[PDB]
Ligand binder design. Sequence first.
Ligand SMILES: COc1ccc2cc(NCc3c(COP(=O)(O)O)cnc(C)c3O)c(=O)n(O)c2c1
Ligand SMILES: COc1ccc2cc(NCc3c(COP(=O)(O)O)cnc(C)c3O)c(=O)n(O)c2c1
Lengths: 428, 422
Amino acid sequence: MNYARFITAASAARNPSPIRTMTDILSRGPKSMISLAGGLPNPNMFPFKTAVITVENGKTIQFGEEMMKRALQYSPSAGIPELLSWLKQLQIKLHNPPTIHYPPSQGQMDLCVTSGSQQGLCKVFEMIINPGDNVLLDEPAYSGTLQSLHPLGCNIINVASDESGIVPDSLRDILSRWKPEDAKNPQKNTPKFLYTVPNGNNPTGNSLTSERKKEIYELARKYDFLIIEDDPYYFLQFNSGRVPTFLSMDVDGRVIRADSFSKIISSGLRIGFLTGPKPLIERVILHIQVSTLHPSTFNQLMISQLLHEWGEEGFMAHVDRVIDFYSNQKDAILAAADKWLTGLAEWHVPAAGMFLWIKVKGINDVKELIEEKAVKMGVLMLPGNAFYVDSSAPSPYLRASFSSASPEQMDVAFQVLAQLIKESLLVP
Amino acid sequence: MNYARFITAASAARNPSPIRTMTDILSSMISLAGGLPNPNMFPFKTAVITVGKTIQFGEEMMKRALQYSPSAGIPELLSWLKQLQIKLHNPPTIHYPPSQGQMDLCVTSGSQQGLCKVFEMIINPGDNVLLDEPAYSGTLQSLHPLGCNIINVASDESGIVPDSLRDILSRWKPEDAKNPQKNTPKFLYTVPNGNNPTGNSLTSERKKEIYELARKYDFLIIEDDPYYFLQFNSGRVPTFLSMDVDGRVIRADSFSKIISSGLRIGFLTGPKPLIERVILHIQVSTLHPSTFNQLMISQLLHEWGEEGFMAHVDRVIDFYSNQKDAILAAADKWLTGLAEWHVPAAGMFLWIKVKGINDVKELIEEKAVKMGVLMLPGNAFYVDSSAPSPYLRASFSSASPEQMDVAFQVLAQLIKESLLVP
Ligand SMILES: COc1ccc2cc(NCc3c(COP(=O)(O)O)cnc(C)c3O)c(=O)n(O)c2c1
Ligand SMILES: COc1ccc2cc(NCc3c(COP(=O)(O)O)cnc(C)c3O)c(=O)n(O)c2c1
């Protein structure tokens, strides 16, 4: 398995910056080192000098003068080394991927810090996708991936999904149009990858089971395609005992995993990370180098100090508090839906994340109900249309986030929704 | 302007997110719309940043700083930067209707992101683009995978030579810009102040000549100006943006050189239909620039005012001007007779030509690194980086005068060792 067939010609031709070239030789020379190489602003001319950041149940984070100069300066494209090594150990403890000690050419596990998991996904899609390429995913899907994929000119093949995510039988039936050996022939145009959000899918709230992940992985080996495991709700699972990830079962080095801090630590800091085969991670870093140069040094240092002070134990205690809060929010939205929506709509318990996916019983298109009537009433939800490749098609579905509204706000919101649905159903 | 000829099919196919669409429909509200983390679950609570003044993020300011924000930037930073552009450049496009290229702005994750999104918006494989070599390696390394043909325009001590541009453009007829099969240039890219790596700046007269050739052959101008606030010459030269009567200028500005490089904050100024395409691409790549870092810059600009910002740039110019003199003094002392250079007009680089060496790559990459001195070989700043180069780039931004003295003393010795061999 070579990574060359998956990547575009343009991604393969990317070269490191002349500084990244010098940085290699910097560690091959003496300790004296005088540098006249970079266009770095002088660290003594920065207007910010020190910083103190308070942490609820934790040590205050402090950036003294020297740390502040580093925080305000350019840093490596792949991320600061202390955050990279901490995240690498986190992945090993959580997923123990088979690829850890593989040689680099065979897809050795590598990591890079990205400006949210959105940047990681975007760079992955751009590295892989040629116009006309086949890609697999289950609809409804995250609108940010659909809007990333759409300008790339790929053919998006929808794979059926139910309460337990992707239905492996649907994937098996779709793949039966090709023969396994067609993956070795580029004119056969076999799928490049399967994209999935395995825990609390945006927008469904549905999660894949361990058994289905094993079945999906075996179909990925058979037809030799990559798996893009976009897991930002990994640390927001409501089920007791986490399900193994695709990364944990990645014997082939065919999994690219996107992780985010947006849902558990901070969304505004724009900090995520990508885990996958070293040749593919290297291509992503090179693209990052010409786009954003690197993720914010300041925000990485903040997170790194918080993570190092917490330890694996303090980080896990924070996720427990987060899961407990969202689990109560999930119960509150479910109680509001039971009280006002029973008989008018279909839904079930989300397995992870922050969304409730509701199907309105006798309405073909919910877009006018949500975009017009509900807006005039002071209630904001997302119509299902936003989560399909064909967003112009009518949708009976709506996405309701339970992340921030109070139980009483959920009650009033669903009372308004029920009233508007009933009014629309009574029109002959 | 027909902006459609400067935007690829993929860029035109981009749509706003469902959240932007919902927000636009809005006029007591309950929101179950966004996948926003709960703002009361964030582990960071308050922040104090010393500037002897202080910047404070109180509890609610911190919740906003740690939360998602608009793709184009936070409104207070956008309005401050918009007023800065109007005061500094007073662009003719301010009150033009949006379709006619009304001046618009967006915050980017450094000026590198802005440039990258601009190139990806305009470039189709095989398209012709103009620039002067030696050029910034970050733009060459952005353009190269895009499959465009890079046409080198001659430059001297005063930047692009308009006669060179005029001669290159003479292969087409002005009317060929209306015919897509003629493949006329899409844009001219330039760093008008303290070019990376030369340190050379364009004059007002040349900018006017280049702008008239841009109208005649209907191409855009990408004015990448991160060293705009690092000019050593008395009285700033007008920008291409200030003379943009047509709405053909896209300007990239950065805070990396004057405020902070690690914060990843820059901005793009240009025609509204072009800026809109850039925002949409940003929306699917990074979502938005860090809210926390934008709020840090915004609060600093609020404490400072235009007065404090302008006094900071004056102190910054003064510091780099002394650094420039120190590197010039070190070059006079050790390099005279061995190398060629002239006075940089702006920025942080000295561009040196080694007198009797065809390729400096082995002298800089091997010999210099071994002696503890780091510089960049000229090779890095050309489309054809495999071609031999007698040039080197020396940055005067951070080394002390005494470090420059030892560095040039080492360089001089390495040059002599390379020349003395028959
Ligand atoms: C770790 O070593 C480093 C790191 C970064 C740089 C950045 C440099 N230049 C930046 C630049 C930009 C983008 O800058 P930004 O606004 O920050 O995104 C845009 N246009 C022009 C003309 C530029 O020169 C540079 O020259 N050297 O050497 C570096 C050396
Ligand atoms: C201003 O309103 C907003 C702002 C942001 C979001 C972000 C959302 N999701 C983020 C997400 C990402 C990228 O996340 P990041 O890591 O932060 O880049 C990756 N994969 C999946 C599956 C995701 O769901 C969302 O659903 N809504 O509604 C938003 C609404």
